[PDB]
């Protein structure tokens, strides 16, 4: 294996606090850091954690093609990889979600035979779900770039969530330091009118970028987006959320094949699990405390853990080593090079803890860290799921 | 305002490392922590950070309805909020992505007048994009729960990415500790055959849950999913990625209205920005170093920052306060209660720094931490970074 590595990481959206613990650890360990971030508090923070940082934003310029900038950013990173160094690239949000140069740099590095990896981060869509109080699972989610959405005539589903990025620069790919003049916005509004109608809601969303700010969560009708003083509020960090227009019915063949009925139970398509989506037009009130909810809450007084439940039963030495593997990239690289040698040098481990670390298998680690009861084995991964349509049928 | 708050946070997918700095700080600051996580190293880590934690997973049981469990989890959290405490709920991944009880608890607390907020985290879909080397923007992304996909007959787009969660428990909502018997998996395989054809690829994806493990990124044809040896590999943490079957063409009217028009250039739908999606069937090789790429690289030697570029120009004292507001929830609460009193007790700030913090305005803070040059008063101002696809392969 060749000297040199490229790891691309994210900052998240909200300054400093939305960075992951592993993103931070890689930035600290790197020989060289290259970054493109949105706010100066995040920039200042990065520079305190590594002595050899370069700002990629300086490679944009007025009238200079963005694709030429991306080629330059990628080549700067890959040049240091070719010299045998551990390089880290840092981008705003999740570094592979609506970003060009990260994918280019990683693919070049990988094809020339160097180690290459992207670490995930928190994206603007992750913030959207949290701030607007929606779940992509209910009733499904479509995500597009706004100019692509129009140019390639991408389909909408009126029964699912729709999220549109880059609504502030329709049809514009030029760079200018004073930013976008969005004079083809009306082409997007026309499309939304044809798909949803003039009175359907559109939510203007801007996630807070500093820890003290509130998010923008402003509902307008499609028609109001034609008003000049509303249209001008949409800029370079604006995203649209468009809620469903209707509820989709269930397919009788699938109901049969999945054996979800004894008779026609009357699970109406409009019947919902609390809470309902508050942006959806003409959505009725859902009762949070039904008779079945009240009865479930009554059982809490008598509750004990079930006999099959596995309590945590670990040690300081074992918790410390699992933490070190997640937060120290050098410790992890040593462990992966030689499981046994590494396991032997960790002090205070019991024989089981040492044996599980030597093997590295998930089940071995679970047994060393959790007490497994007789009743469970006689018949042990969690099995947590989201419930929607099935829980409201039978 | 009523005493008490609820903050729901995530742990991410890979044990410990994928937790956010703010998730950790809220767990440390809470009066009571309630958690549901699926690996013991993450559980042990949480327990080292707060002395009053309760595992919510103990409220599942064999034959007991998952909805009744959800009602119970929600009520344990909100009972403590109603006592005036700062409560933190912790869920695997992103706490609002394919999760029931988080939304219920937050909605109840909000309607009754308490402070309520969800902090985003890293989901399994975030992991998927990073490990499979795809971008949702190119060529768009549809995400569904697998049983909902079948029952409500949700539409596919053959020209965009498709992501399906919960493919290991098609049609089944019961709880059992010994787990899912995935007997209706064939119903999903039939639908994928109808929509994509028997020889189209499906990627079986499992993100690494421990730091030393590799992800599962195994490509199969739809037809191969009918083989029992392959179907048995699909479990409770399995997600499917199905890549596009074809490239979608551009609309002439939109090209004309957006003025990307001059002469009719012949930018083909199959032509792509490097790199191409490696999972897509019959994807052509794309050249990383075209003549224009080489010309751009040659300009690197003569490069200087543009006149309008804004270098960072801040202080240790200002950087420390902005870091503290992000990592210390009590300091943030104090700052929000009264900007001016907080700003006046921070030592070593310059007059401009102190004034910007008194205002709280993002432009004022930016101007205090960056050298904004005279070539740049257009405001009466973020980076202006975008993704480029179709437009960059036209004009
Ligand atoms: C080039 S993309 C960068 C996306 C980033 N990598 C991420 O993880 O979200 C630019 C677009 O992201 C979205 N975006 C960026 N910041 C945002 C914010 N604070 N709130 C809402 N959307 C935002 C907007 O649609 C913007 O046009
Ligand atoms: C109830 S959901 C929870 C999702 C979680 N909140 C998140 O942010 O991704 C369970 C489903 O998430 C997906 N999932 C969970 N862990 C995963 C992993 N390690 N790799 C791939 N998919 C996973 C699977 O589709 C699984 O059936």
Numbering used by the authors:
A (entry chain B): 7 to 385, 397 to 411
B (entry chain A): 7 to 382, 384 to 387, 397 to 411
Published text:
While chemical methylation of an amide bond uses a strong base to generate the imidate, OphA, the precursor protein of the fungal peptide macrocycle omphalotin A, self-hypermethylates amides at pH 7 using S-adenosyl methionine (SAM) as cofactor. Omphalotin A derives from the C terminus of the OphA protein, and it is the OphA protein that methylates its own C terminus using S-adenosyl methionine (SAM). The structure of OphA reveals a complex catenane-like arrangement in which the peptide substrate is clamped with its amide nitrogen aligned for nucleophilic attack on the methyl group of SAM. Here, we report the structure of the peptide amide methyltransferase OphA including complexes with cofactor [SAM and S-adenosyl homocysteine (SAH)], cofactor analog, substrate, and product.
Y76F and Y98A led to highly aggregated protein, and only a small amount could be purified for analysis; very little folded material was obtained for Y98F, but no methylation was detected. Y76F, R72A, R72K, and Y98A were unmethylated even after 3 days of overexpression in E. coli. During prolonged (12 days) incubation, there was some evidence for a very small amount of methylation in the Y98A mutant (>100-fold reduced in vitro activity), but not in the Y76F mutant. A different conformation of Tyr98 is seen in inactive mutant complexes (Y76F-SAM, Y76F-SAH, and R72A-SAH). Y66F retains activity, and Tyr76, although within 4 Å of the carbonyl, has a Bürgi-Dunitz (44°) angle incompatible with attack, so both possibilities were discarded. Both Tyr66 and Tyr76 are, however, well positioned to stabilize the resulting tetrahedral carbon by hydrogen bonding. We therefore hypothesize that, by disrupting anchoring interactions, the flipped conformation can be adopted to relieve the steric clashes between SAM and the amide that would otherwise occur. We speculate that the flipped conformation of the substrate (seen in R72A, Y98A, and Y76F SAM complex structures) resembles an intermediate arrangement that occurs during translocation.
